[PDB]
Amino acid sequence: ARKSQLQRRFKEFLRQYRVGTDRTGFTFKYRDELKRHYNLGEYWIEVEMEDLASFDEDLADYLYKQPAEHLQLLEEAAKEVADEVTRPRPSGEEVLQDIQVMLKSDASPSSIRSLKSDMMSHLVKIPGIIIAASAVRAKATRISIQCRSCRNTLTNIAMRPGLEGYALPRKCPLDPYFIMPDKCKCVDFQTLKLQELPDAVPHGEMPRHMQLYCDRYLCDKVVPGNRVTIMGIYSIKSYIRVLGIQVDTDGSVSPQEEEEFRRLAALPNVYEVISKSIAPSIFGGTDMKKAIACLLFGGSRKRLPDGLTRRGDINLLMLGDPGTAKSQLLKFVEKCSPIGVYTSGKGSSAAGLTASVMRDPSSRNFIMEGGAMVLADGGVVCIDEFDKMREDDRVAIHEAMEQQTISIAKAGITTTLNSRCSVLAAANSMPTILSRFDMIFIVEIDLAKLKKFIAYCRVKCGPRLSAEAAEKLKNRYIIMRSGAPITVRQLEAIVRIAEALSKMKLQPFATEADVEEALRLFQVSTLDAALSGTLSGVSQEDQEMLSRIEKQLKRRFASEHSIIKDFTKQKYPEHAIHKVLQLMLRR
Amino acid sequence: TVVLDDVELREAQRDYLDFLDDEEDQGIYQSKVRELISDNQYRLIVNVNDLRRKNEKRANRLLNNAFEELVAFQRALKDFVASIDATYAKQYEEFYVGLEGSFGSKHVSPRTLTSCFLSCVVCVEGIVTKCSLVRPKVVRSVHYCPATKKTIERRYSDLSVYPTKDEENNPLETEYGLSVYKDHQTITIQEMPEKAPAGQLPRSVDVILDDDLVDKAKPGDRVQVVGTYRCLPGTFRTVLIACNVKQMSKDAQPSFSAEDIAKIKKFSKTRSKDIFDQLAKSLAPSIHGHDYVKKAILCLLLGGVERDLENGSHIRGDINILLIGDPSVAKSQLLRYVLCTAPRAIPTTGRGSSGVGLTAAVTTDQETGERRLEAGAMVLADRGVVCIDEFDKMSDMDRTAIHEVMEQGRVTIAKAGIHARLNARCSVLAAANPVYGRYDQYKTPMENIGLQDSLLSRFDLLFIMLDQMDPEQDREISDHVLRMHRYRAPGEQDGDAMPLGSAVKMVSAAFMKKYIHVAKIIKPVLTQESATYIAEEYSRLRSQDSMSTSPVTARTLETLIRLATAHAKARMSKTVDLQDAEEAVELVQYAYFK
Ligand SMILES: Nc1ncnc2c1ncn2[C@@H]1O[C@H](COP(=O)(O)OP(=O)(O)O)[C@@H](O)[C@H]1O
Numbered sequence A: 001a002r003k004s005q006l007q008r009r010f011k012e013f014l015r016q017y018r019v020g021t022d023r024t025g026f027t028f029k030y031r032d033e034l035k036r037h038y039n040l041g042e043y044w045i046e047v048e049m050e051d052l053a054s055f056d057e058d059l060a061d062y063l064y065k066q067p068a069e070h071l072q073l074l075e076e077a078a079k080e081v082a083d084e085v086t087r088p089r090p091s092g093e094e095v096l097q098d099i100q101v102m103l104k105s106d107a108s109p110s111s112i113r114s115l116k117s118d119m120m121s122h123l124v125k126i127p128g129i130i131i132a133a134s135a136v137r138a139k140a141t142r143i144s145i146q147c148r149s150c151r152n153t154l155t156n157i158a159m160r161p162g163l164e165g166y167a168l169p170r171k172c173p174l175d176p177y178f179i180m181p182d183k184c185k186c187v188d189f190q191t192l193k194l195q196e197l198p199d200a201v202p203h204g205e206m207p208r209h210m211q212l213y214c215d216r217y218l219c220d221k222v223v224p225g226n227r228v229t230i231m232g233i234y235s236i237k238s239y240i241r242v243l244g245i246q247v248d249t250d251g252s253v254s255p256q257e258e259e260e261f262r263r264l265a266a267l268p269n270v271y272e273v274i275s276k277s278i279a280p281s282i283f284g285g286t287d288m289k290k291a292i293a294c295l296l297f298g299g300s301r302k303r304l305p306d307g308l309t310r311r312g313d314i315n316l317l318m319l320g321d322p323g324t325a326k327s328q329l330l331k332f333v334e335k336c337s338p339i340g341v342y343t344s345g346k347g348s349s350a351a352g353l354t355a356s357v358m359r360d361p362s363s364r365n366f367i368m369e370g371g372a373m374v375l376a377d378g379g380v381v382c383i384d385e386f387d388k389m390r391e392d393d394r395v396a397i398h399e400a401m402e403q404q405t406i407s408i409a410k411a412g413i414t415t416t417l418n419s420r421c422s423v424l425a426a427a428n429s430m431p432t433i434l435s436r437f438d439m440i441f442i443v444e445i446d447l448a449k450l451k452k453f454i455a456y457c458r459v460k461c462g463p464r465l466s467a468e469a470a471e472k473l474k475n476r477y478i479i480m481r482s483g484a485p486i487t488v489r490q491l492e493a494i495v496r497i498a499e500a501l502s503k504m505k506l507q508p509f510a511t512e513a514d515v516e517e518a519l520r521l522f523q524v525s526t527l528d529a530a531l532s533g534t535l536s537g538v539s540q541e542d543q544e545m546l547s548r549i550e551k552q553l554k555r556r557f558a559s560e561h562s563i564i565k566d567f568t569k570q571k572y573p574e575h576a577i578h579k580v581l582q583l584m585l586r587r
Numbered sequence B: 001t002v003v004l005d006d007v008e009l010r011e012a013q014r015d016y017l018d019f020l021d022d023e024e025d026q027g028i029y030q031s032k033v034r035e036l037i038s039d040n041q042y043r044l045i046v047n048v049n050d051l052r053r054k055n056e057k058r059a060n061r062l063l064n065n066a067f068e069e070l071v072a073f074q075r076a077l078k079d080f081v082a083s084i085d086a087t088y089a090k091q092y093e094e095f096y097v098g099l100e101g102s103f104g105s106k107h108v109s110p111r112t113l114t115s116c117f118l119s120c121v122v123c124v125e126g127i128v129t130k131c132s133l134v135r136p137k138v139v140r141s142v143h144y145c146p147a148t149k150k151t152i153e154r155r156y157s158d159l160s161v162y163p164t165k166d167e168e169n170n171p172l173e174t175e176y177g178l179s180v181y182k183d184h185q186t187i188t189i190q191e192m193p194e195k196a197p198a199g200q201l202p203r204s205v206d207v208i209l210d211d212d213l214v215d216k217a218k219p220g221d222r223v224q225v226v227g228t229y230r231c232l233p234g235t236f237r238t239v240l241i242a243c244n245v246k247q248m249s250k251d252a253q254p255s256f257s258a259e260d261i262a263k264i265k266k267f268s269k270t271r272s273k274d275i276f277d278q279l280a281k282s283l284a285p286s287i288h289g290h291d292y293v294k295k296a297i298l299c300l301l302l303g304g305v306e307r308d309l310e311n312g313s314h315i316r317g318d319i320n321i322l323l324i325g326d327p328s329v330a331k332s333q334l335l336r337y338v339l340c341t342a343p344r345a346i347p348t349t350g351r352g353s354s355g356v357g358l359t360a361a362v363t364t365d366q367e368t369g370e371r372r373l374e375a376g377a378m379v380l381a382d383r384g385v386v387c388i389d390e391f392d393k394m395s396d397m398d399r400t401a402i403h404e405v406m407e408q409g410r411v412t413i414a415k416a417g418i419h420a421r422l423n424a425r426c427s428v429l430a431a432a433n434p435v436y437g438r439y440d441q442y443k444t445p446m447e448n449i450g451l452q453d454s455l456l457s458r459f460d461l462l463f464i465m466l467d468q469m470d471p472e473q474d475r476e477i478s479d480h481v482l483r484m485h486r487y488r489a490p491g492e493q494d495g496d497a498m499p500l501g502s503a504v505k506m507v508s509a510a511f512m513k514k515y516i517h518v519a520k521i522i523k524p525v526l527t528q529e530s531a532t533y534i535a536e537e538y539s540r541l542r543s544q545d546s547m548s549t550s551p552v553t554a555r556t557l558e559t560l561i562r563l564a565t566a567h568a569k570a571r572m573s574k575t576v577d578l579q580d581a582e583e584a585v586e587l588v589q590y591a592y593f594k
């Protein structure tokens, strides 16, 4: 029950601990790790709470109950063991550097919702997905002040780690004191925002947000959008003192659930069952339900031989009417999706659909916040009024749907945020984006069971095209080109739809019948596209009429409202007139 | 309450004076200081390694403790200069010391410049992104009181402050001549874009320059600054006080490993005739056809050899390529492959980097209301490659700006009362889809997109790639696409797709990047036989111009020379060969004659 005794316990645990066996030797894992790190420029370690508990359960109990103080003792013990292990440091290097001890545990995560104040100042471990990150700044831990009048100095004033303020003395001239930065010691500092995982969000509830504080090497290890698990000290200034970060670099179901899913796949009408079973509560849907099902299951995120990756997601656009029940349909689908984010083109969020870097005045510092796209990475993004995106959002969405990544730029350096989100957009009437939408349409199983099946299939089965199916698609594509329009990007969209259809049945490969169904959906989309060329036409006839506008304007000249009205009365679309005017301005 | 004397400071000063007192030895530093006096400069460059050799402990003290040790070193240098020459020492109030040489661990980059280095000498290498206007800064102000007939002085240094009245409120008038002002500038440094992972956030370090160090840096310059990293007065904004700034060659060299060099040599010596063909085939395997386009992209990557003449001309060794073609073609995919393969390439769109656009710009900080000359994408692409998408959508101001960089390779900005002429030598690979799609082979490429035909003149190669609906070509493309999509990794069980990750004959892309980076260093030269052959081929091209793309002219001749040099680089040959000229000629024929 003495601090020195506890520090001795930590020192012996770090240096004397043994891992392996007689065959593999009783290696001092922590001793070797400390030696390797100090020989390098790491000056940190990873502590396995399981290892500590195995060595001395009382130490783990102390860390859980009182994390800050025992953590300081453990850090000092790490310093001592590193010093003794690396006592003969070369010239100049003989100055001993502090060691940041980072700790990990095998214990199951804890829901962010289940965080009582009683655990404040008690070690916690919670999962989440980061939504915003802060520029790495410098925060002082050891400071010294001087009395402007008396010249009295108070050196090495320890500042408790965390998002706390300062403590200026009342006097020895009264309170005024001068900080002397020369001897001040500071460490890196970084504030992050962690959000509850979309899986665990309550129905119709906004996920809660927490502030995380990472200072030493543990900072700058994560970027907004990452799925992480954090061990730290629950603190209240309300925030978390981070002590260990695990990033889900890869990946992230009861046997009865698997058996039920296998049964569902085995159903011959599984395609029809899913199509009909999604939204029985809504009326006026024919093969749009099938399209939404294909979007939910999504295609296969392939990795080409050269190492590049081709978006496995399928983007669906619904063009048409405000009166239709696509708001209800979007709400239902985002509810059903294992990861679903629903917003509008005018969501009004500071980040917006994509990420955004903004200087917060509260600290006057750059904060990078993740938009809806990045948050729904690996899920679905429902976008009402997709035609009403912001200028920056309009610029970003091109790459967002192209490379499935959001790229922000600082001078030369560029940060990339993974957004592998299938987009379900709704609009009434920029046009370049329409080219990148895989499918465009003009106007039983429980929801939870559907979501579970979707997640299971998505994480387990990724289909591929069979030789017969691929050859059938190739011949069909040649026929469509000969008749014509169809583009290679549309061929890739058809391939993704076919892969999604095969995945619905949990088949390793895609049958030619699956290609036929995918082609049926794409032919629905393409005859709809013919009548959309009638709707939009943004096209040999359009080019000819644009040339007619060019000739007419050349003849006229070589108010603005009157000119626009006349050309519109000449059957010329307003968009065509504006495009011609802009082109002639560029010339 | 005044320090009568200090033993440590005296010892340090005397030791530094002894070190500079290089007369009983090689005399390197005594000669250095003599040359410094003769040159009128007042900043001695000192190799830290020499100090370590003479005294390891003293060098360790200097590195760990920077401010005090540097003050002592400056004192010793001034004393030594006075001893050698008193009048010259009197000319300058203080003489600064600039460090140099290898730093064990203090040599870091802005990404790795952790806060643990505070108060320690650091050697930060990076790319200058923002620069501030040179402004005078008062370091010592002298005031005069006529009422008391008394002259007072004040020092600001690192420390309403400007004194204006005597303690009795008698007016004080400044003595501008006597007071001491030094020119002062602020810049920003970031890690080299090539070696800066996208996962991490940007890491920018501010740098303060004074005296002769002021203008020895510009945006878009890869520079190494050795200085003292200090905390500004109070969260604590951190800045690096520069002791010396040196611009390192942007070309640099491919350090890599001896094994990589041996592999490159073996690959080059295996089949030099077909090496270019194999690299072109393996450039973008996901894309079918477009063989000549891939060859041109490879030539751009290798790039020509810049020629600088006695008259100050700077005939550019870069190669610029433009790609026009119907949508749903691999243009964007080709640009992505170039980004993934080019040794040092930067992506951008028609809009360019936000605010700064493509070329440099002048921006008011709006945090302190201060002007800053911020480098754009083109400037940061210097001696590299810039991959422009949607080149048609470039703004009119950018349309005018791109002209100067394309012509001369340097961007000049005088707006906002800020003068700058930043190097922007960078090969540009631009892709622009034709307006209203469905390219028509009736109008000129200018009239198809709108460039004024002057940019078309600037671009060396302009490739028109149309989506011809040939059943045979379509079958080939579809077969290639489906074969790529069906492809499965060597180890897999036809199961799951690649798990979602939180981290962002045929030669490996990394190997190709390394090989082209190594080849770029070579400096091939023309051969008389090659010169005659290229002259004959150029005459033939002019002759073929009789029939009525852009006309063949001297621009085409320089393009052919650059392509021949690039293909010579591909084979590593120190001299161009008839094969290189023939390949360049056939490529140009394809570009201008389908
Ligand atoms: N020759 C080709 N071989 C393989 N894929 C192609 C080819 N031409 C086009 N593509 C397809 O086009 C898509 C990329 O189109 P993109 O370059 O973005 O169009 P654009 O550059 O005209 O906007 C890729 O998915 C690619 O598979």
Ligand SMILES: [Mg+2]
Residues within 6 Å of the ligand: B331, B332, B389, B390
């Ligand atoms: Mg493109």
Ligand SMILES: [Zn+2]
Residues within 6 Å of the ligand: A147, A149, A150, A151, A152, A171, A172, A173
């Ligand atoms: Zn006092």
